Structure formats: C-alpha cells, structure tokens
From a paper:
In the work reported here, we determined the crystal structure of the σW4/-35 element complex, and analyzed the promoter binding mode of SigW. The crystal structure contains a σW4 monomer and a double-stranded -35W in the asymmetric unit. However, residues 125–133, which correspond to α6, are disordered in the crystal structure of σW4/-35W. α8–α9 of σW4 forms the HTH motif, and α9 is inserted into the major groove of -35W as a DNA recognition helix. The recognition helix α9 mediates the major interactions between σW4 and -35W through hydrogen bonds and hydrophobic interactions.
The ECF sigma factors are composed of only σ2 and σ4 domains, which bind -10 and -35 elements, respectively. Of these sigma factors, SigW induces the transcription of its target regulon to counteract cell envelope stresses caused by antibiotics, alkaline pH, and high salt concentration. In the absence of these stresses, SigW is downregulated by anti-sigma factor RsiW, which is localized in the plasma membrane.
Numbering used by the authors: 134 to 186
Write the structure that this text describes.
Amino acid sequence: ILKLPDKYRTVIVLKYIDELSLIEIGEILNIPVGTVKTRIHRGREALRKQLRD
DNA sequence: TTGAAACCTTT
DNA sequence: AAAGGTTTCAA
C-alpha cells in the first residue's frame, strides 16, 4: 500500500511475502542479518506513518 | 540518518 | 536455543 525508499521496502516484501528468513534475506542479498533487522524495522515504521493518507 | 552489533522478546 | 524485533553507535 506504500512506496517508500527502495531499501526499506525490499526487505518487507522479501520476509513477509515469501516468508524469507533473516539469514535468507541476508545470505541471498549478501548482507548482514543485523542490517536485515534494521531495514525491516524501518520499513515497518515508515509504513505505519504513511498508512495514514 | 544509515549500517550494524548488542540486546531483549517471541517462537 | 535460535529467530525475530528493538535500542543504540559510529560513520
């Protein structure tokens, strides 16, 4: 329902839709898991704020 | 305001 | 215990 930065949205699409794990999102995107956590947290809070149109 | 490990909580 | 979320830090 919302288009934000490209970084935020990628990981929410990845983990929620195909139930992509965090190590999965990482090892496949070749990026640290902590980073997956931060991208997911901020994709969420950005949806929250911009779910109120 | 990014990337990332530490650090709590949920499963 | 391991995955999932959060708070915090340095660049």
